[PDB]
Tab-separated table of N, CA, C and O in Angstrom:
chain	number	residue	atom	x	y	z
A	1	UNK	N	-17.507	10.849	23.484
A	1	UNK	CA	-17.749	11.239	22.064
A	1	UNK	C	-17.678	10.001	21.177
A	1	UNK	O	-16.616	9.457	20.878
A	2	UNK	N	-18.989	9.559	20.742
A	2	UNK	CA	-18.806	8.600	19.921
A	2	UNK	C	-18.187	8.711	18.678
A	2	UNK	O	-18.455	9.767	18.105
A	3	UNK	N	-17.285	7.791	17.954
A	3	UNK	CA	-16.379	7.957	16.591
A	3	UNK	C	-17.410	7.253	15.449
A	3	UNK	O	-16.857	6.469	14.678
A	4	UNK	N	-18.257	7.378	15.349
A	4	UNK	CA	-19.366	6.590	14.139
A	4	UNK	C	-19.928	7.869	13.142
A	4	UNK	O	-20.115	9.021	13.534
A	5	UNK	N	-20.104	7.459	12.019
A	5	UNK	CA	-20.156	8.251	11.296
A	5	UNK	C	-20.667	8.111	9.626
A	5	UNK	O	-21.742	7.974	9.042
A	6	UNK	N	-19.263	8.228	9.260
A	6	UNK	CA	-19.350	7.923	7.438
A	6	UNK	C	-18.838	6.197	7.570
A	6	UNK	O	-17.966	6.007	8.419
A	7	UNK	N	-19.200	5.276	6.990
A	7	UNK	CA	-19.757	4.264	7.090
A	7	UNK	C	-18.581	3.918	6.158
A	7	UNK	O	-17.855	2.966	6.443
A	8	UNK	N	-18.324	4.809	4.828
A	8	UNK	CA	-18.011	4.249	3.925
A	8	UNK	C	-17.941	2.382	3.230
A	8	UNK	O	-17.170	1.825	2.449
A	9	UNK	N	-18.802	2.052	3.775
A	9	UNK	CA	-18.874	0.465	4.055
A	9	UNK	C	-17.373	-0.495	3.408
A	9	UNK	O	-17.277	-1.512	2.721
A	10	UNK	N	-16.527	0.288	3.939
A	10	UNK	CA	-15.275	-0.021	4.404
A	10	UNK	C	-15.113	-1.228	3.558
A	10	UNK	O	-15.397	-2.387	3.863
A	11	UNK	N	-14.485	-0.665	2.161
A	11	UNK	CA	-14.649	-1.536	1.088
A	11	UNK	C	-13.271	-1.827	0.928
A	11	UNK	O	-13.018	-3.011	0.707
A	12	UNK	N	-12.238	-0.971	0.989
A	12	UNK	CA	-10.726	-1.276	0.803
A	12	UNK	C	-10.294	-2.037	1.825
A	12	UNK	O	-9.226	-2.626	1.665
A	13	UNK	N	-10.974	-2.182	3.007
A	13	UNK	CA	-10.663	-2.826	4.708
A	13	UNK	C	-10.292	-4.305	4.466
A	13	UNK	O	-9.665	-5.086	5.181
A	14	UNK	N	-10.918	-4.480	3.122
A	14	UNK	CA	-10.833	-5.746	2.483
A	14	UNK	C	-9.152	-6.493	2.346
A	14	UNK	O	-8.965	-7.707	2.428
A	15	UNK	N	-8.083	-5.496	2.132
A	15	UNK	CA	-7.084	-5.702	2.111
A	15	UNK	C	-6.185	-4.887	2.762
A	15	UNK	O	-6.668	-3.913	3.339
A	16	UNK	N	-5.114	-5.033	2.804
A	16	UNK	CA	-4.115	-3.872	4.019
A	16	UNK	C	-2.780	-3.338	3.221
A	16	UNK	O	-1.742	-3.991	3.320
A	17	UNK	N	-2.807	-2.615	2.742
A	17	UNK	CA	-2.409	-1.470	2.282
A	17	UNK	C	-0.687	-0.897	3.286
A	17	UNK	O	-0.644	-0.918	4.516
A	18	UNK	N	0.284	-0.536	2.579
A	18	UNK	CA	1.091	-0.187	3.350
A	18	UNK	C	2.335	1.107	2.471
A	18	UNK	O	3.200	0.635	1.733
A	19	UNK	N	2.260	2.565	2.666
A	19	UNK	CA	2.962	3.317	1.620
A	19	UNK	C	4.201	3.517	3.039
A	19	UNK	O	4.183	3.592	4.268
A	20	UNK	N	5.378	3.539	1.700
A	20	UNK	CA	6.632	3.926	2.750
A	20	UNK	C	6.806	5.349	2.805
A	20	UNK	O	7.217	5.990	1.837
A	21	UNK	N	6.476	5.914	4.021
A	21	UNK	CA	7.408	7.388	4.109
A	21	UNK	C	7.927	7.422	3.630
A	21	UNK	O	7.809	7.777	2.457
A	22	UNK	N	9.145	6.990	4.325
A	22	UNK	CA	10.648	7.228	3.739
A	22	UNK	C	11.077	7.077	2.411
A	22	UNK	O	12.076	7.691	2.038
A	23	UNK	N	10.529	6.428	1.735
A	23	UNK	CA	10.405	6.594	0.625
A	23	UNK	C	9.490	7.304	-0.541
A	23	UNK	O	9.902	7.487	-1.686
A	24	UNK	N	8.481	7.591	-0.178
A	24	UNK	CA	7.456	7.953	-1.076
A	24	UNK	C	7.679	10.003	-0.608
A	24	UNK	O	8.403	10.841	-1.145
A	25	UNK	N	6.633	10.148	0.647
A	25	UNK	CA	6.659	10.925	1.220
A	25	UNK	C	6.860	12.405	0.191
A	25	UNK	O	7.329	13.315	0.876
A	26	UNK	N	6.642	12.768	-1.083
A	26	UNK	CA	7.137	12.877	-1.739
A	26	UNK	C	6.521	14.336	-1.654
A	26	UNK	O	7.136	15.399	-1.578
A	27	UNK	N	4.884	14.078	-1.694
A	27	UNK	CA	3.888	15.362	-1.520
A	27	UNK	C	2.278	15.253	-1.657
A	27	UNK	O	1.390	15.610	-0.883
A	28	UNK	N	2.238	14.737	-2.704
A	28	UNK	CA	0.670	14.395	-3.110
A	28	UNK	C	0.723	12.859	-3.077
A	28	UNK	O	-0.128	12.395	-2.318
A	29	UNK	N	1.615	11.797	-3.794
A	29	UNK	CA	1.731	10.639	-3.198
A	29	UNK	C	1.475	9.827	-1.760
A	29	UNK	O	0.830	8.831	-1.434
A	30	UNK	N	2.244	10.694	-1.146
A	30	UNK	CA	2.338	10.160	0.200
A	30	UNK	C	0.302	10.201	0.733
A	30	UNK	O	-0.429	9.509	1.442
A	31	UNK	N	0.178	11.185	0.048
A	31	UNK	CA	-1.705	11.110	0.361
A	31	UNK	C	-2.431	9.711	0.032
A	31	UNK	O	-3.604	9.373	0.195
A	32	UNK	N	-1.487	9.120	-0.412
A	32	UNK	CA	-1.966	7.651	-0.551
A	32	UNK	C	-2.563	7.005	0.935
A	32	UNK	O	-3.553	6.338	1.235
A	33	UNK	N	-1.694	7.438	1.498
A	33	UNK	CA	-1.982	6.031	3.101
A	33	UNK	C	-3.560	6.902	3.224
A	33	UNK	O	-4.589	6.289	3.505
A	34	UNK	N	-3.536	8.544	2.940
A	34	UNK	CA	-5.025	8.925	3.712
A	34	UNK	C	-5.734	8.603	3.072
A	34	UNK	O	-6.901	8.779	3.421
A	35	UNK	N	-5.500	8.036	1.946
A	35	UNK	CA	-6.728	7.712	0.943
A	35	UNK	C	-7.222	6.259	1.578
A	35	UNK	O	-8.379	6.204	1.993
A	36	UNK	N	-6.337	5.025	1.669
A	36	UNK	CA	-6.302	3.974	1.764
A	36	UNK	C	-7.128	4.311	3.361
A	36	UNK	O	-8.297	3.928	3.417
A	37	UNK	N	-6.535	5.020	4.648
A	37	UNK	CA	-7.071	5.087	5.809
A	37	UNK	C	-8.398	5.303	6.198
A	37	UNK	O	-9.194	4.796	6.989
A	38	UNK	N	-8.374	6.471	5.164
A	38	UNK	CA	-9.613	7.427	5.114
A	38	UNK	C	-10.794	5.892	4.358
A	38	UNK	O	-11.951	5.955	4.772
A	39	UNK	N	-10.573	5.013	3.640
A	39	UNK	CA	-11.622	4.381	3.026
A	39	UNK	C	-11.952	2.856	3.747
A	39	UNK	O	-12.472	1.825	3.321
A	40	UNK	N	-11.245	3.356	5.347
A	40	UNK	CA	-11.517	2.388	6.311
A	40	UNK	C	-9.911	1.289	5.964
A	40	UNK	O	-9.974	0.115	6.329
A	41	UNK	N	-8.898	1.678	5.432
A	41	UNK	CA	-8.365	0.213	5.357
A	41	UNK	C	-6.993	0.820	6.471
A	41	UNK	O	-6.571	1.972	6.372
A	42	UNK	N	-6.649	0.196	7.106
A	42	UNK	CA	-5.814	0.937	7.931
A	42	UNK	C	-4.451	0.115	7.641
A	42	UNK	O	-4.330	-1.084	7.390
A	43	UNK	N	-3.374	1.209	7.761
A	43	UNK	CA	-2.457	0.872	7.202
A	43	UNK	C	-1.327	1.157	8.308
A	43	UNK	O	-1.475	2.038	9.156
A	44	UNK	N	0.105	0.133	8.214
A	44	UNK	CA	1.195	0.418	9.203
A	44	UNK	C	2.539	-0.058	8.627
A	44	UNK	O	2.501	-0.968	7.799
A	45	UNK	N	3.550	0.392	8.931
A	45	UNK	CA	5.245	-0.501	8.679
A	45	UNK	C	4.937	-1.336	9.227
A	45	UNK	O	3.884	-1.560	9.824
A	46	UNK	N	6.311	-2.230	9.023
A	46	UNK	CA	6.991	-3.279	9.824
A	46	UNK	C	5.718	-4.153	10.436
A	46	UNK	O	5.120	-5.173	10.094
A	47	UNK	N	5.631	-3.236	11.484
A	47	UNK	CA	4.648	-3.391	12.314
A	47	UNK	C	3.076	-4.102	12.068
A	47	UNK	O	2.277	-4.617	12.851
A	48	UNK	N	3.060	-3.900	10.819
A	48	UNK	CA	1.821	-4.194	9.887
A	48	UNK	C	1.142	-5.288	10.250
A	48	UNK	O	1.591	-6.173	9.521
A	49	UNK	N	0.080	-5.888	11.156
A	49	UNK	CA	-0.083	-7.409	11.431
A	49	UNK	C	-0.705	-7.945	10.538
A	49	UNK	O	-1.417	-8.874	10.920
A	50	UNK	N	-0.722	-7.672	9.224
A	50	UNK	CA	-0.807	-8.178	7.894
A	50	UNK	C	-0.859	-7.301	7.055
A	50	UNK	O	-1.918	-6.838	6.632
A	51	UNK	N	0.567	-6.855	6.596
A	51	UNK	CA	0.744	-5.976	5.781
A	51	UNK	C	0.961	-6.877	4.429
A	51	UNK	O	2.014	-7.507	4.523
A	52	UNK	N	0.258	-7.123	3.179
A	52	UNK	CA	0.909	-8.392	2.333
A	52	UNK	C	1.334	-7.611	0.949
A	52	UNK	O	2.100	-7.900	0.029
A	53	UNK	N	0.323	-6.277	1.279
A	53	UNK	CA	0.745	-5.350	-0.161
A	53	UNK	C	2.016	-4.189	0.692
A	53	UNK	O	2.326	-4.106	1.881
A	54	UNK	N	2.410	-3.576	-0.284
A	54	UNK	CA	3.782	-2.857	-0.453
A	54	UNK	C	3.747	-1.667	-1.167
A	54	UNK	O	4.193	-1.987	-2.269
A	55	UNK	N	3.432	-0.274	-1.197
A	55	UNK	CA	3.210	0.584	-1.715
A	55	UNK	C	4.233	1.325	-2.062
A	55	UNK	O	4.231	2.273	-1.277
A	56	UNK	N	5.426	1.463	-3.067
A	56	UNK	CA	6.638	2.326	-3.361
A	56	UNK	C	6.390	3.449	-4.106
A	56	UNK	O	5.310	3.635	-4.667
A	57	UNK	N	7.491	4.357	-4.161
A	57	UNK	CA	6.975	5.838	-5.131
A	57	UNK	C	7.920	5.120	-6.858
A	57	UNK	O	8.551	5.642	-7.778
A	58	UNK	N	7.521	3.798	-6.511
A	58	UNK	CA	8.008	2.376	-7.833
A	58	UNK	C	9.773	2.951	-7.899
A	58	UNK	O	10.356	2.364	-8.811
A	59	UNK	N	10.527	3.768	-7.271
A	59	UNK	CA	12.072	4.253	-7.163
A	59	UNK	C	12.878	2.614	-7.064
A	59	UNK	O	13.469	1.791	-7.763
A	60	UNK	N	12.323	2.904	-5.425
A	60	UNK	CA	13.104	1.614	-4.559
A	60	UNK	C	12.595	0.419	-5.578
A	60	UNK	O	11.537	0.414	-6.208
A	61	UNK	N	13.622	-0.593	-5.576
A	61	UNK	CA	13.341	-1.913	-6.067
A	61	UNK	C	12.530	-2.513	-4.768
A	61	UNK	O	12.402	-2.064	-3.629
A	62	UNK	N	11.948	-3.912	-5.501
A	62	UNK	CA	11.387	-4.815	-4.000
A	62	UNK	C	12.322	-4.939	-3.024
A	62	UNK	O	12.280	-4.419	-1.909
A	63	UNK	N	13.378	-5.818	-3.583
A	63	UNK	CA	14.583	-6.234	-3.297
A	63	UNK	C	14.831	-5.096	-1.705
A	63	UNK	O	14.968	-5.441	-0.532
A	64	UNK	N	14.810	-4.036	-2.178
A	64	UNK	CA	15.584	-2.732	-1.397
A	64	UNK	C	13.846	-2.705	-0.018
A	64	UNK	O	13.783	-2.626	1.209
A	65	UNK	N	13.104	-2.784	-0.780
A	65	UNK	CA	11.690	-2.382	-0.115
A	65	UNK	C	11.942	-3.123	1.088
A	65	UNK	O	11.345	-2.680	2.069
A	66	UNK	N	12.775	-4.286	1.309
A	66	UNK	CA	12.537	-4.822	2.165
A	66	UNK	C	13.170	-3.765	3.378
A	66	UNK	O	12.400	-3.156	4.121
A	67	UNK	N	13.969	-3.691	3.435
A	67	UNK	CA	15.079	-2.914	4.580
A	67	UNK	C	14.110	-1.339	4.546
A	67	UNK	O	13.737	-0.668	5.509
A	68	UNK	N	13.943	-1.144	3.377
A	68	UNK	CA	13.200	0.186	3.221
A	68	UNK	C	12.306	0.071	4.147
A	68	UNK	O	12.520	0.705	5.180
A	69	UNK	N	11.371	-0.549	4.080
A	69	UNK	CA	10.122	-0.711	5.316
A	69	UNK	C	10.523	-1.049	6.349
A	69	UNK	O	9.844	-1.058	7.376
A	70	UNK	N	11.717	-1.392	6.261
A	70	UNK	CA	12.094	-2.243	7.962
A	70	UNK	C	11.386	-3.450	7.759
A	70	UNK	O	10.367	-3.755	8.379
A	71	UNK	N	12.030	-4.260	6.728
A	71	UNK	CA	10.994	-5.863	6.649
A	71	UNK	C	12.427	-6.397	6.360
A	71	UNK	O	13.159	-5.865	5.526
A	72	UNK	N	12.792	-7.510	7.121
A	72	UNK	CA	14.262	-8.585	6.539
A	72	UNK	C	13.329	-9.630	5.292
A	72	UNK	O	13.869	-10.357	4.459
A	73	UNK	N	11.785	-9.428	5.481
A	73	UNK	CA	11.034	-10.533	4.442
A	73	UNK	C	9.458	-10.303	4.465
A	73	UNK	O	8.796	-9.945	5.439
A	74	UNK	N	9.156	-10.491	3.615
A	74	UNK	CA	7.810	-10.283	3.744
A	74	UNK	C	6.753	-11.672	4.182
A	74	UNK	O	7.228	-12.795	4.015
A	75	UNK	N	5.567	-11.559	4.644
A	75	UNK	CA	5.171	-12.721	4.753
A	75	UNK	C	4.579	-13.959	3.473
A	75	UNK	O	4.889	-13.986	2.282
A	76	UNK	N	3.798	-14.750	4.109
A	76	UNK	CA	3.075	-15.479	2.902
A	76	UNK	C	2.575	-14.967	1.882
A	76	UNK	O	1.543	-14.316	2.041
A	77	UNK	N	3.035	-15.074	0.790
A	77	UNK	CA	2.339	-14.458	-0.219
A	77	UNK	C	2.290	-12.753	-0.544
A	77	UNK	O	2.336	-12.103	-1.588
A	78	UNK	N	2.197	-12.471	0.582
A	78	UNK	CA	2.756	-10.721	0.505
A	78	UNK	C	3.328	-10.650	-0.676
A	78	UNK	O	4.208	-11.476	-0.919
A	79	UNK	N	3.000	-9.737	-1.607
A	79	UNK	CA	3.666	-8.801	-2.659
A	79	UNK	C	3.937	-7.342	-2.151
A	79	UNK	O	3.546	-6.860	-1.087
A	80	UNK	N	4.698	-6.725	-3.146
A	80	UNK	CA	5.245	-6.024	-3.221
A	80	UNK	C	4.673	-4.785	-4.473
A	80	UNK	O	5.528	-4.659	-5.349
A	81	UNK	N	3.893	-4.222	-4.613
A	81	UNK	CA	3.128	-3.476	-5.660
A	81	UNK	C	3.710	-1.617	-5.710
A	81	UNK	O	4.596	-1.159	-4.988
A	82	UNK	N	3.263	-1.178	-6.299
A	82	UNK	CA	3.814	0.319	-6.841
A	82	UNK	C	2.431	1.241	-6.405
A	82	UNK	O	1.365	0.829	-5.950
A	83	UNK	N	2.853	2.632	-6.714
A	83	UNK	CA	1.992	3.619	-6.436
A	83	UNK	C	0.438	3.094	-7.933
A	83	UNK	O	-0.735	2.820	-7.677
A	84	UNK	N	0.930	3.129	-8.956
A	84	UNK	CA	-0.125	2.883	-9.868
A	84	UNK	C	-1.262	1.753	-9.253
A	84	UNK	O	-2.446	2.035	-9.440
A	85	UNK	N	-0.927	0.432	-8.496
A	85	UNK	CA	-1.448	-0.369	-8.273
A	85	UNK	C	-2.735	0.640	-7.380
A	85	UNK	O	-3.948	0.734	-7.565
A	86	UNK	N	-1.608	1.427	-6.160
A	86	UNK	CA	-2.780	1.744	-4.915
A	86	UNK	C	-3.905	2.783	-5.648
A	86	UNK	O	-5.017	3.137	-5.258
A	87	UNK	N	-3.429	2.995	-6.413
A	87	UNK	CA	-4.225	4.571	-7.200
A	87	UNK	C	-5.785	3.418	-7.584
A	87	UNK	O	-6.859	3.678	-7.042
A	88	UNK	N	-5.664	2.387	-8.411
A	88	UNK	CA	-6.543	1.732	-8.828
A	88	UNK	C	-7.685	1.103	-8.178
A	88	UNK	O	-8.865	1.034	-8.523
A	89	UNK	N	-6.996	0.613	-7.045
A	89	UNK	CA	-7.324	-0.157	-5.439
A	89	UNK	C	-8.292	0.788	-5.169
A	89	UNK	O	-9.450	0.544	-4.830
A	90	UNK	N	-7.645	2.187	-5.373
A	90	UNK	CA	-8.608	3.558	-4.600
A	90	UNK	C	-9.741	3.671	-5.653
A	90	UNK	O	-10.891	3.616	-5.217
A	91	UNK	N	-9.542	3.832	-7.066
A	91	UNK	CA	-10.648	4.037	-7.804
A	91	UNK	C	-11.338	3.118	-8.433
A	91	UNK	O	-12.395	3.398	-8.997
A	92	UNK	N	-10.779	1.790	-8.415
A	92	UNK	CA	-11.672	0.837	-9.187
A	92	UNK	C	-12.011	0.038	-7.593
A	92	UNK	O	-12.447	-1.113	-7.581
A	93	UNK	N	-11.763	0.763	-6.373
A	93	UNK	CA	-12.331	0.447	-5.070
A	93	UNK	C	-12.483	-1.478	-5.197
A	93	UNK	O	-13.448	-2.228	-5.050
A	94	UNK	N	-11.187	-1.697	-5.497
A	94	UNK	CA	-11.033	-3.764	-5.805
A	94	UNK	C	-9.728	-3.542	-5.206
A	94	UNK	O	-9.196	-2.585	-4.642
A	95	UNK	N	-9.221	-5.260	-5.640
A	95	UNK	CA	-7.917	-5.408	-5.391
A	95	UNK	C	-7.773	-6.164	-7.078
A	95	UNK	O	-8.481	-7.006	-7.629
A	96	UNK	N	-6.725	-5.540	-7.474
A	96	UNK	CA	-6.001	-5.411	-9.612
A	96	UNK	C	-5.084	-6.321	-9.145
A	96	UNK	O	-4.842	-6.629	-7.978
A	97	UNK	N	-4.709	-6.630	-9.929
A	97	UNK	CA	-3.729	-7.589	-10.063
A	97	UNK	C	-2.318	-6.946	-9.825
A	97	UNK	O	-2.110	-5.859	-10.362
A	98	UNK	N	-1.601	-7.365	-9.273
A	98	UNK	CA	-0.215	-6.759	-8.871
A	98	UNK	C	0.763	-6.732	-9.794
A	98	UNK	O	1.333	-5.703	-10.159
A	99	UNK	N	0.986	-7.838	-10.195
A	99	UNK	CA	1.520	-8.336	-11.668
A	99	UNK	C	1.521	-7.118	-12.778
A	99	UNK	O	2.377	-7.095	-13.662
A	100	UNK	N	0.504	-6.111	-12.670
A	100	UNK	CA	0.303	-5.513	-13.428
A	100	UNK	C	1.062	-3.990	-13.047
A	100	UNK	O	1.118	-3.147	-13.942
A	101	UNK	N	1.689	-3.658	-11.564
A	101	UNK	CA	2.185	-2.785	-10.866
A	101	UNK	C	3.323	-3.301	-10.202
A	101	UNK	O	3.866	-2.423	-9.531
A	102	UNK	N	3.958	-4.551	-10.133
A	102	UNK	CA	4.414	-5.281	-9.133
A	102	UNK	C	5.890	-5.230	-9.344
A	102	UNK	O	6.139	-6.084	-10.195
A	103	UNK	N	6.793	-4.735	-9.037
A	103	UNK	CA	8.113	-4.974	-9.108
A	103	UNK	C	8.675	-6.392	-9.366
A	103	UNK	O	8.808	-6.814	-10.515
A	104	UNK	N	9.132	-7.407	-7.838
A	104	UNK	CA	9.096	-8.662	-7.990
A	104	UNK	C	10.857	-8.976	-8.046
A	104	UNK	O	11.575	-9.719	-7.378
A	105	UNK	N	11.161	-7.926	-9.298
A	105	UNK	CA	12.412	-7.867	-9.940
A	105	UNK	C	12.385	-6.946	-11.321
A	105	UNK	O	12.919	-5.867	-11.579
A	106	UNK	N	11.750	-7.608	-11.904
A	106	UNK	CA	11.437	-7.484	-13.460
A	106	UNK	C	11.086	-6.160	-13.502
A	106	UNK	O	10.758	-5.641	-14.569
């Protein structure tokens, strides 16, 4: 059975996307990862082999996000962004500025 299909020309694939269960999981939120999956960008914890964005229900601080995801650190440049960021990602189908969703601390 071949898996080919909707093409969506896999525009979010562009970047890698990552929502925490354990944290978010909330109800309609957590539909984030299928949004992000579903538009070709595939998403994972920890595990992430380039996870650089960070998807929170914005609760958890970064700070906390780390252990939250099961991350002691994130990689190069990896941020750390909020649910508002992924919502945008999904409808303005780009990558927004994080800064503008981004924990960090601040």
């Amino acid at each position: 059975g071949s898996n080919s299909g909707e093409e969506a020309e896999e525009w979010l694939s562009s970047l890698r996307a990552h929502v925490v269960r354990t944290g978010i999981g909330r109800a309609r939120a957590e539909l984030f990862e299928k949004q992000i999956v579903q538009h070709g960008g595939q998403l994972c914890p920890a595990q992430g082999p380039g996870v650089t964005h960070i998807v929170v229900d914005e609760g958890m601080d970064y700070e906390r996000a780390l252990r939250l995801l099961r991350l002691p650190q994130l990689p190069p440049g990896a941020q750390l962004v909020k649910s508002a960021w992924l919502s945008l990602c999904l409808q303005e189908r780009r990558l927004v500025d994080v800064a503008g969703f981004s924990i960090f601390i601040p």
